[PDB]
Motif scaffolding. Structure first.
Motif, short mmCIF file in Angstrom:
data_model
loop_
_atom_site.label_atom_id
_atom_site.label_comp_id
_atom_site.label_asym_id
_atom_site.label_seq_id
_atom_site.Cartn_x
_atom_site.Cartn_y
_atom_site.Cartn_z
N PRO A 194 0.80 -1.23 0.00
CA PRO A 194 0.00 0.00 0.00
C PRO A 194 0.83 1.27 0.00
N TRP A 195 2.10 1.21 0.39
CA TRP A 195 2.96 2.38 0.49
C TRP A 195 3.37 2.94 -0.87
N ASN B 44 1.89 6.14 -2.33
CA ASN B 44 2.05 7.27 -1.42
C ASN B 44 3.52 7.62 -1.22
#
Ligand SMILES: *[C@@H]1O[C@H](CO)[C@@H](O[C@@H]2O[C@H](CO)[C@@H](O)[C@H](O)[C@H]2NC(C)=O)[C@H](O)[C@H]1NC(C)=O
Ligand SMILES: *[C@@H]1O[C@H](CO)[C@@H](O[C@@H]2O[C@H](CO)[C@@H](O)[C@H](O)[C@H]2NC(C)=O)[C@H](O)[C@H]1NC(C)=O
Ligand SMILES: *[C@@H]1O[C@H](CO)[C@@H](O)[C@H](O)[C@H]1NC(C)=O
Ligand SMILES: *[C@@H]1O[C@H](CO)[C@@H](O)[C@H](O)[C@H]1NC(C)=O
Ligand SMILES: *[C@@H]1O[C@H](CO)[C@@H](O)[C@H](O)[C@H]1NC(C)=O
Lengths: 387, 280, 49, 82
Positions: free
Chosen positions: A319-320, A323
């Motif tokens: 998920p990083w 971002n």
């Protein structure tokens, strides 16, 4: 606070010692943790190798090792290091946007010039010096040999005139008298000017274009192209440079040299280059440029090639990624990476005037030797006066 | 710039410490050495003779009457002729050496930061509706506000404005400006900082969010950059003739010598006046 | 199409084809100065005669 | 300085200076004043500097005299951009 193996040397117990880590990557990770809040636990990889696809002794199995062996096995969650991005590494894990663009290049130990004691007399051969000295002596004696038997100049007078005219000084004020002696003196003065002019010209030729080994023209250097025993050139074993050398087909003969000589880490390789054990080190442009800035006696000369960037990798799906990529791009956009580059890479002490004192200290040594032999000469003159 | 910076004359050829040491201490020691040889006639006359024969021929001065003193002055004159020859060779080499200059370095220069506090306002801008303009606005709003006055229309317009002189600096993508400088004739245009890059970003191939082609495109690009195709593509397209490669000197080059000679006869005149007052 | 020049400069090329790329800084031998030496000897002979 | 010396005419001084500039060796212009002699000495050193600079600059001018810029075949940059 970062935990790592104590001894890099293989064959030693690698106890987990809690050292402290700092610098570019650590500050970047701290900035990332400040942007999105997440506690980080930094540790060093057990094996100093970066990590390449290696065929273990167990056949029919490709294994990732090093920090990528840590990451892919689940023993790590994110990596922050000057890791070169290539196809093999992109196949198994996804990389963020690069935080430092660089490329492969060559670092060599700078050859400081050496000044010998015979620099002043270097352009003329020793045989030439002996010949001109013998000619000086014979012509000087035959001046007064011809002048003495002239009804229409002595030993010392003719000798000093000869030295003065060959020396552009004028020590001997006595002058030739006979017409043949006059013509002889004029021709000797012309020969002296020719000698001194040619000697000045040879100094000019020798002083300029003075470089024993021009450079390495990147990888396309023919001397680098052909492996040899004396030209020992290497790179860090089991790293991105090794993968790039192995995979691209034309360079494979160069790869034939690689397995002959390798070093466990970059520090050992640069120490060997400093100690003249290695003739060339193949490594990333950023690291080698920083070392040249710090190690002021080493120079990066190879042309930049294999352009890429250092990237921070994670697992296949994380998920990083979006971002962290957005945040690192924002850091590039504003004035942050420039601050890191200034405070961790840019600062330097020396990176690199002609005819210094050490260059021709021989002339001052000769003058000092004449000064200290003047007492011997005056003692000989006194002894001659006694007789 | 019209005239590149000239490297210092007669400073590189000889070190200043060498200058002073072999113009003071060697001469003093040699004078003491020759005066005792002559005595066994005057310190001043011997000093003047040795100083005269240091450089070159001059009006003849009385020669030493001692053979050992003649040997000493001869072995000094050997050093004198080698000094003359070396002083010719080193200036020859320094003429051979090249020269270069950069007008400004970096973007944080006070010329860019505060163009107002200069008698001529500094002329810099960029084409709008680009990444460079957005970056400038996001980082330094004042720079964007100032450059809106000196705006540009296109790349070729900016290049011709720089060539004529209407504009002084042009901020734009590093690759495009590097290509233009390389292809430019005469190489009158150059990047600041010798290839200084601020944004250190790259060109990417845009794709729709969640597009299935992202992974394959990334793998293909990595394979191409790892097999070196980028290198010959760059040589075919991005190569510039300007990058990767002083017949005479003017009065200003040797102006230091003339000013030193000016101080020289000034000191001679004041010494003459001082001697006249001392005699008075 | 020009593949031949590339293939010959990849295979048939050699290292001794520079042929004009050595500084070759060197001294002056006896024979080089022998010309002015012989001129000086002739000058001495004509002075004697 | 020689005229106002406490203890050589203008033409003699001129010929002294000219023999300083160019090493004719005529001499015969020795000044009598202390400051005059030291100034002649330093001016002779400066004349040596000037003539050495002349020789060096002439050498630099005549070592490189290639305006032709012979074409290096098809690899010459001028061929790429007509
Ligand atoms: C990545 O950043 C985006 C932008 O802030 C995050 O999206 C927001 O997340 C917060 C909290 O989860 C929500 O309240 C907002 O509504 C979200 N906004 C948008 C536009 O999505 C996202 O959560 C971040 N993801 C990670 C993994 O850090
Ligand atoms: C940058 O974008 C603006 C906004 O579209 C452009 O301004 C337009 O310019 C055209 C031609 O002069 C006009 O017909 C439009 O009316 C303008 N639109 C607005 C909103 O002002 C501008 O030309 C663009 N600049 C460049 C260099 O592309
Ligand atoms: C790590 O090794 C060094 C020397 O090899 C030793 O002095 C040190 O005590 C070791 N670290 C620990 C935690 O024992
Ligand atoms: C910080 O962490 C908390 C939970 O620990 C989270 O709710 C918050 O969104 C994070 N970011 C902030 C406070 O900016
Ligand atoms: C010199 O400066 C002028 C502006 O003063 C400029 O137009 C010109 O291109 C420069 N170069 C030459 C060779 O004139």
């Amino acid at each position: 606070i970062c935990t790592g193996p104590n001894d890099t040397s293989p064959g030693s117990p690698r106890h987990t010692v809690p050292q402290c880590c700092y610098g570019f990557c650590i500050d970047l990770l701290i900035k990332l943790a400040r942007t999105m809040n997440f506690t980080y636990e930094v540790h060093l990889v057990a094996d100093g190798k970066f990590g390449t696809q290696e065929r273990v002794n167990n056949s029919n199995k490709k294994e990732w090792n090093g920090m990528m062996g840590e990451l892919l096995s689940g023993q790590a969650d994110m990596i922050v290091a000057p890791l070169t991005i290539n196809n093999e590494r992109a196949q198994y894990i996804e990389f963020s946007k690069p935080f430092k663009y660089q490329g492969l290049t060559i670092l060599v130990k700078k050859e400081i010039p050496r000044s010998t004691l015979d620099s002043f007399m270097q352009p003329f051969q020793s045989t030439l010096w002996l010949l001109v000295g013998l000619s000086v002596h014979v012509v000087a004696v035959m001046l007064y040999l011809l002048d003495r038997f002239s009804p229409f100049l002595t030993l010392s007078s003719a000798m000093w005139f000869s030295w003065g005219v060959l020396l552009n000084s004028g020590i001997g004020e006595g002058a030739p008298r006979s017409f043949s002696a006059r013509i002889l003196g004029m021709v000797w003065a012309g020969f002296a000017m020719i000698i001194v002019a040619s000697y000045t010209a040879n100094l000019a030729a020798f002083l300029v274009l003075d470089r024993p080994e021009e450079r390495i023209t990147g990888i396309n250097d023919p001397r680098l192209r052909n492996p040899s025993d004396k030209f020992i050139y290497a790179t860090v074993k089991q790293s991105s440079v090794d993968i790039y050398f192995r995979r691209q087909v034309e360079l494979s003969t160069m790869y034939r040299h690689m397995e002959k000589h390798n070093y466990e880490s970059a520090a050992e390789a640069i120490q060997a280059v400093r100690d003249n054990k290695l003739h060339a080190f193949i490594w990333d442009s950023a690291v080698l440029e920083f070392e040249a800035s710090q190690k002021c006696d080493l120079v990066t000369t190879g042309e930049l090639f294999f352009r890429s960037g250092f990237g921070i990798g994670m697992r296949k799906d994380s998920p990083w990624k979006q971002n962290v990529s957005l945040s690192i791009l924002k850091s590039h956009e504003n004035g942050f990476m420039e601050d890191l580059d200034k405070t961790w890479v840019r600062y330097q002490e020396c990176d690199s005037a002609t005819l210094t004192f050490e260059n021709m200290a021989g002339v001052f040594m000769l003058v000092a030797g004449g000064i200290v032999a003047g007492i011997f000469l005056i003692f000989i003159e006194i002894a001659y006066k006694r007789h | 710039s019209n005239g590149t910076v000239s490297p210092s004359a007669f400073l590189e050829p000889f070190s200043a410490s060498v200058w002073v040491m072999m113009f003071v201490m060697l001469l003093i020691v040699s004078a003491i050495a020759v005066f005792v040889f002559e005595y066994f006639f005057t310190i001043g006359k011997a000093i003047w003779l040795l100083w005269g024969l240091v450089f070159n021929n001059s009006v003849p001065v009385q020669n030493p009457k001692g053979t050992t003193s003649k040997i000493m002055v001869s072995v000094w004159a050997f050093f004198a002729v080698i000094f003359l020859a070396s002083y010719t060779a080193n200036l020859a080499a320094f003429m051979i050496q090249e020269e270069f200059v950069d007008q400004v370095t970096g973007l944080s220069d006070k010329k860019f930061q505060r163009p107002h506090d200069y008698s001529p306002p500094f002329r810099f801008g960029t084409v709008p509706n680009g990444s460079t303009e957005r970056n400038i606005r996001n980082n330094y709003p004042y720079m964007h506000q100032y450059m809106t006055r000196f705006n540009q229309r296109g790349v070729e317009d900016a290049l011709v404005s720089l060539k004529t002189g209407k504009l002084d600096a042009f901020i734009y993508d590093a690759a495009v400006l590097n290509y233009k400088a390389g292809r430019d004739e005469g190489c009158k245009l150059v990047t600041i900082g010798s290839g200084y890059i601020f944004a250190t970003t790259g060109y990417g191939i845009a794709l729709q969010k969640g597009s299935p082609w992202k992974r394959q495109i990334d793998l293909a690009l990595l394979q191409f950059v790892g097999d070196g195709e980028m290198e010959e593509l760059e040589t075919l397209w991005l190569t510039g003739i300007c990058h990767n490669e002083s017949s005479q000197l003017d009065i200003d080059n040797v102006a230091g010598v003339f000013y030193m000679l000016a101080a020289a006869m000034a000191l001679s005149l004041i010494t003459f006046i001082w001697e006249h007052l001392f005699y008075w | 199409d020009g593949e031949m020049e590339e293939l010959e400069t990849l295979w048939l090329t050699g290292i001794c084809h520079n042929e004009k790329n050595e500084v070759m800084s060197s001294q002056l031998d006896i024979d080089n100065v022998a010309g002015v030496f012989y001129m000086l000897a002739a000058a001495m002979a004509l002075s004697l005669i």
